[PDB]
Structure formats: structure tokens, C-alpha cells
Design a binder for this molecule. Structure first.
Ligand code: HEM
Length: 131
């Protein structure tokens, strides 16, 4: 199951120091738009939020209610944080790089499972941007 593959990988990632540090380093480096959005964010706190957020995307992919993803859609929409849909591709690229760096068993199957599993929830979030 793709969600199972992602859960196994994410366990190894969270067990590896520097995973979330590296994610944000890659994500911030990817565009000045990302740096501008996070310029007055407590990045230590944000890493905890992201850890839980990725868990929410996995729970959705395992069959939980779209309620939490709808809420993320609202919070990241144009009317709130205002996160343009194009920025999620940069988020996913940064995640995949961090996974490759921190999951010792990462292979093509792992990477495709991450893209598939995260992509489902990302689609929901993006769909609310202009709502
Ligand atoms: C699927 C991908 C994403 C997940 C799982 C995620 C998760 C979260 C969570 C849980 C929060 C805190 C609660 C909330 O507002 O919902 C948050 C806040 C925030 N997110 Fe995201 N997010 C994602 C994508 C993005 C992207 C692509 C950006 C682009 C820059 C972004 C920018 C922000 C900003 C600027 C905040 C507020 C930071 C602050 O000022 O303290 N997020 N995100």
C-alpha cells in the first residue's frame, strides 16, 4: 500500500536528526516567494507544525474524513495565508530531497509513493485557493 510505504519511510525520516531542518533549508532556498512568506515565522515551532501536517496528509490518504484538509485549504487560501498553487510543487520537491537525505532505504518506489500520497492531499488544498 502506498500509504504504508510512506509511513515506513516517514518513521525513518523522523528518526533521523536534521530531517525538518533540511526540509526547510531546501524549501526556503527554492524561491524568494517562500522566503518572503516565512520571514517572520518561528521556524522551530513551524517544524513541529509540519510534522503534524504531513501526518494529517497521510491520515487523509488512509481514509480519514477530508475535514482537516479542507481546513488547511481554507488557511492556505487566497483569503488567508495566500499560498499560490505553484508553490506546492516546490514544497513537494523539497520534501523529496529531505526524504532522499534522511531515509536510508529511499528508492524509486519510496519516492513515487511520497509523490502519490502527498499529491492527493495537495490537490485538495490547492482546490480551495480561489474559493
Ligand atoms: C501540503 C503542503 C503543506 C502543509 C501540509 C502545510 C502545513 C501547514 C500547517 C499545519 C500550518 C500551521 C496551521 C495552518 O495554518 O494550517 C502552516 C502554516 C503556514 N504555511 Fe503551510 N503547509 C503546506 C504548504 C505550504 C506552502 C506550499 C507554503 C508556501 C510558502 C506554506 C506557507 C505557510 C505559511 C507562510 C504559514 C504561516 C507561518 C507563520 O507565519 O507562522 N505552507 N502550514
Amino acid at each position: 500500500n502506498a500509504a504504508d510505504r510512506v509511513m515506513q519511510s516517514y518513521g525513518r525520516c523522523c528518526a533521523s536528526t536534521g530531517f525538518f531542518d533540511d526540509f526547510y533549508r531546501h524549501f526556503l532556498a527554492s524561491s524568494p516567494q517562500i522566503r518572503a512568506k516565512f520571514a517572520t515565522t518561528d521556524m522551530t515551532a513551524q517544524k513541529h507544525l509540519l510534522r503534524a501536517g504531513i501526518m494529517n496528509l497521510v491520515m487523509y490518504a488512509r481514509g480519514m474524513s477530508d475535514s482537516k484538509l479542507r481546513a488547511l485549504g481554507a488557511s492556505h487560501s487566497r483569503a488567508a495565508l495566500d499560498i499560490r498553487p505553484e508553490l506546492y510543487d516546490l514544497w513537494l520537491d523539497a520534501l523529496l530531497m529531505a526524504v532522499a537525505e534522511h531515509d536510508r532505504d529511499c528508492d524509486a518506489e519510496t519516492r513515487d509513493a511520497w509523490r502519490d500520497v502527498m499529491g492527493r492531499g495537495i490537490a485538495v488544498i490547492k482546490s480551495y485557493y480561489g474559493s
